[PDB]
Amino acid sequence: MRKITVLSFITLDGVMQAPGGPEEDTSGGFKYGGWTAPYEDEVSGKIMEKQMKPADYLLGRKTFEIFASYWPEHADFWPGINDGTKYVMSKTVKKSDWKNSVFLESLADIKKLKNSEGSDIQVWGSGELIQLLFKNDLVDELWLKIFPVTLNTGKRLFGDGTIPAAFTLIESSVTPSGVIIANYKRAGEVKTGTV
Amino acid sequence: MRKITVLSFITLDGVMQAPGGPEEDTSGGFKYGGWTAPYEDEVSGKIMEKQMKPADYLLGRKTFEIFASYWPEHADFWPGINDGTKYVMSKTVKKSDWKNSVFLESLADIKKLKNSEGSDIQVWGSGELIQLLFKNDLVDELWLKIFPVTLNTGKRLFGDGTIPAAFTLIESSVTPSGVIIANYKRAGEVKTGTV
Ligand SMILES: NC(=O)c1ccc[n+]([C@@H]2O[C@H](COP(=O)([O-])OP(=O)(O)OC[C@H]3O[C@@H](n4cnc5c(N)ncnc54)[C@H](OP(=O)(O)O)[C@@H]3O)[C@@H](O)[C@H]2O)c1
Ligand SMILES: NC(=O)c1ccc[n+]([C@@H]2O[C@H](COP(=O)([O-])OP(=O)(O)OC[C@H]3O[C@@H](n4cnc5c(N)ncnc54)[C@H](OP(=O)(O)O)[C@@H]3O)[C@@H](O)[C@H]2O)c1
């Protein structure tokens, strides 16, 4: 079995759409592409490089295409994404010029990929795919960066796939710019008492 | 001008309905009342006894009535809620036997309270009222506690009144149970750029 880690940049109110630039995702006329920009720091970069260790990848087709437009030409900065096998969920695209690209069509394919052998799987972006993962409880770890801004509109990490589920805080840090690094692990059912 | 601080317990996906008990808020058949109970420890008790220092209070009617059923008899534990003035937003309640309770009816009345001279203001619970405060940018500070669960259902802090806005992280902390404490201050317009 493989460890599927979802990594995600979110606002205070959970919005994940277009973190890196004004045209990254204009669905809905989203006006706030690039909201992570004013919060990029040195410390933040060091955290990123630890998360940019080579591994395998599971991506939604849109996130894969966004990546394919940029990252093959910058294999220096992020080698793992070029070197590791990228598993892409799509009914639309069955081939890519990007090296190490395998295309999956159904939930069963994702599951077999989990029950396979190989490097642990990272999931970046891919909010729509993440909803299917959450709904079938296939995500084992969550690495969030939480940014000191609120934007009502936008695609959300915790969307229509989210399920009642408990987590364990594995690690937390704070950047100088005010971003909170919080990594969690799945921990069984939700507990309620009376305070 | 008075400072308005919103204090709020939320899940990872932003839910804040019924932290304290199975029956605190059964709206929608909400099954997870009490989800905050398993994350209670000593050091969190010290964290939030100083968060409960004497102030004035602005509350929605439902939160006020939840409080009024319990706290008048536990002024031992939280004397601030009893001694401070509780400004309550309601169009259906004009009086309470809980002493030092004034009932306001309008946005104009909240604005007048903010302008008027007196102690700083704490908002607890009051998700619906908080929506009106957010939409009118009347919230000066946000003290949050984030819990390692997702619930999918239930009322949320960032709801219909949430507006685009940036914040400064005043301070942060973790809890042995895995709860992040994050205190933010309002800091102007959302800035965008390119990474
Ligand atoms: N905050 C962050 O960390 C971060 C980082 C990078 C990107 N992002 C943002 O993430 C978003 C990515 O776009 P997106 O989430 O809307 O789409 P996506 O998940 O990246 O990919 C969408 C495509 O993947 C396939 N797919 C995904 N789920 C499927 C399902 N349950 N059943 C069948 N096919 C499924 C489908 O491909 P086919 O149509 O080909 O069949 C679907 O159209 C963007 O907003 C991006 O800016 C966020
Ligand atoms: N996570 C936490 O920190 C925390 C702590 C405590 C409680 N809570 C939860 O907070 C929730 C409180 O219930 P709630 O948010 O639904 O209601 P609420 O905000 O506490 O009070 C609702 C009532 O206040 C008045 N009101 C609120 N907004 C108004 C507006 N914009 N205009 C006019 N009147 C307004 C109305 O009173 P009238 O109907 O009389 O006109 C409204 O019915 C509960 O779920 C509670 O469990 C959370």
Neighbour-count burial of A50, counting CB atoms closer than 10 A to its CB (0-12 exposed, 13-18 middle, 19+ buried) = exposed
- For residues A138 and A109, what is the distance between their CA atoms, to the nearest angstrom? 12
Dihedral (Cα; B136, B141, B146, B150), 10-degree rounding: 0
For residues A139 and A186, the answer to whether their CB atoms sit within 8 Å is yes
Closest partner CB to B158 (pick from A150, A172, A190): A150
CA distance A163 to A169: 18
Closest CA to A82 of A68, A66, A61: A68
Cα separation, B58 vs B125, whole angstroms: 10
Query: Which of B84, B119, B153, B151 is CA-nearest to residue B3?
Result: B119
Burial of A85 by CB count in 10 Å (0-12 exposed, 13-18 middle, 19+ buried)?
middle
Residue numbers of B between 146 and 165 with CB closer than 8 Å to A: 146, 148-153, 157-158, 162-165
Q: Which residues 34-53 of B are in CB contact (within 8 Å) with A? A: 34-38, 40
Supply the DSSP string of B105-152, one letter for each residue: -SHHHHHHHHHSSSS-EEEES-HHHHHHHHHTT---EEEEEE-SEE-S
Rg, C-alpha atoms of chain A: 17
Q: Is any ligand 1 atom within 6 A of the Cβ of residue A24?
A: yes
Distance of CA A194 to the CA centre of its chain: 35
The three-class DSSP label of residue A10 is strand
Query: A41: Cβ–Cβ under 8 A, 6 or more apart, which residues?
Result: A175, A176, A177, A179
Radius of gyration of chain B (CA): 17
Cα distance from B144 to chain A (closest Cα, Å)? 10
Q: Which atom of ligand 1 is nearest to the CA of A145?
A: 3
**Binding-site residues, ligand 2, Cβ < 6 A:** B 8-9, 16-19, 24-25, 60-63, 89-93, 124-129, 132, 155
Q: Which of B104, B92, B159, B93 is nearest to B132 (CA)?
A: B159
A14 CB neighbour count, 10 Å cutoff:
24
What number of C-beta contacts closer than 8 Å exist between A and B? 148
| 8 Å CB contact between B148 and A172 | no
Give me the residue label for tokens 């914040």: B167
Count CB-CB contacts under 10 A for residue B144: 19
**B57 Cα: distance to centroid of ligand 2 (angstroms):** 13
Confirm if B174 and A169 have CB atoms less than 8 A apart. Answer: yes
Question: Is the CB of residue A135 less than 8 Å away from at least one CB of chain B?
Answer: no
B73 in helix, strand or coil? Answer: helix
CA angle A146-B132-B74, nearest 5°?
85
Strands B4-10, B121-124: pairing is parallel
Longest dimension (CA), chain A: 57
Domains along chain B? 4-186 (3.40.430.10)
Determine the Cα–Cα distance for residues A158 and A8; give it in Å rounded to an integer: 11
CB A102 within 8 A of CB A88: yes
Give the full edge-to-edge strand order of the sheet including B56-60: A149-150, B165-173, B180-186, B141-146, B4-10, B121-124, B56-60, B86-89, B101-104
- Residue numbers in A near B38 (CB within 8 A): 191-193
Residue of A nearest to B45 (CA): A195
The dihedral built from the CA positions of residue A170, A159, A70 and A27, taken in this order, carries a sign that is: negative
Cα B192 to Cα A22, A149, A181, B105, B166, distances in angstroms: 7, 11, 20, 38, 11
Listed in sequence order, the DSSP H helices in chain B are 42-50, 61-68, 79-83, 107-115, 127-135
| Angstrom distance (rounded) from CA B44 to CA B49 | 8
B121 closest CA partner among B130, B108, B45:
B130
Tell whether A125 is within 8 A of chain B (Cβ). Answer: no
Nearest partner of B151 among B6, B5, B1, B17, judged by Cα: B17
The Cα B132–Cα A120 span in angstroms is 45
List the beta strands (DSSP E) in chain A: 4-11, 56-60, 86-89, 101-104, 121-124, 141-147, 149-150, 165-174, 180-186
Q: CA–CA separation, A25 vs A184, rounded Å?
A: 27
- How close is the Cα of A62 to the center of ligand 1, in Å? 5
Chain A hits for B165, CB-CB cut-off 8 Å, are 149-150
Half-sphere exposure for B45 (CA within 13 Å, toward CB): 7
Query: A128 CB less than 6 Å from ligand 1?
Result: yes
In angstroms, the CA A116 to CA B169 distance is 42
Q: Experimental method used, please?
A: X-ray
Count CB atoms within 10 A of the CB of residue A194. 11
Burial (Cβ within 10 Å: 0-12, 13-18, ≥19) of residue A27: exposed
Residue B21, exposed/middle/buried by CB under 10 A (0-12, 13-18, 19+)? middle
